[PDB]
Amino acid sequence: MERKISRIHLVSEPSITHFLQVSWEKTLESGFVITLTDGHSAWTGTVSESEISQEADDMAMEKGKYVGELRKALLSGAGPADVYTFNFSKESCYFFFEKNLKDVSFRLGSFNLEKVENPAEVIRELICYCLDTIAENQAKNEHLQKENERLLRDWNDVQGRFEKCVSA
């Protein structure tokens, strides 16, 4: 069980960012779960292997390359790599990410979204996971600093020993 959080902008309300979470079990091929949140109310959606296969039928292009494009769009958030725009019609429940290549436009996918009765639970679990990750990374950082200090000490000792041997 793994998941990722990312920041996306909406054309309708550019001034205000929205936060997108994508969670998968083993790999994106089987499917995953998506939630969109904005601090007040959130929507959710699901995707299974059947859905990705239908979309791949629509686009007639490699399964894995579609999966990788989705990976970069939803997880990497790499602006330098051909920025593209995520639009959302809230009332119509249509959250789609249009790809804007130079003088070319593509519709990458279609989606439907449903309003969760309790957005509080999701907007709490998000930040709780975040704080847990922060604590784990702080612990790992401390351990790595300790080990790096040990390595520097050993390097200095070995340098001194080499120097003494050459002097002798």
Partner: protein
């Protein structure tokens, strides 16, 4: 005056003993000693040994950010160990880029290579520019590998 004899031959142990006979001698200065080293080598072809073949070469390192500055040491990099190894091989390590320097070692950074070349063109005696890997290989051969391939 010491143990060793004139007429009869002497073997390893004997030499050891006669050396143990003499207490010590520290009336010479480093320059002198090195000079004599070289001299006897030239007199009796002592350069075939795996080491000391660098004795005839003065080696400078690009271990400083500012050439001919002694206040900007870059200790903490492989270059340092390289230099020390050169010293272990008998290479006369020189902290200052003197006109008599024969070998100069440059690491992964080439930013200052041009400057080195200029200095070479300024010197009556030219010193070949060498990389760090040259020695790192030549050690295994215990011999002076051709510098051209490593120019």
């Amino acid at each position: 005056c010491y143990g060793d004899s004139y007429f009869i031959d002497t073997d390893l142990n004997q030499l050891k003993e006669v050396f143990s006979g003499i207490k010590n001698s520290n009336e010479q200065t480093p320059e002198e000693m090195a000079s004599l080293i070289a001299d006897l080598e030239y007199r009796y072809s002592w350069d075939c040994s795996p080491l000391s073949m660098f004795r005839r070469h003065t080696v400078y390192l690009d271990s400083y950010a500012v050439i001919n500055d002694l206040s900007t040491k870059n200790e903490g990099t492989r270059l340092a160990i390289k230099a020390l190894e050169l010293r272990f091989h008998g290479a006369k390590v020189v902290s200052c880029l003197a006109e008599g320097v024969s070998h100069v070692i440059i690491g992964e950074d080439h930013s200052r290579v041009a400057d080195f070349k200029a200095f070479r063109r300024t010197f009556k005696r030219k010193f070949k520019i060498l990389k760090e890997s040259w020695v790192t290989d030549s050690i295994d051969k215990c011999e002076l590998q051709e510098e051209n391939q490593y120019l």
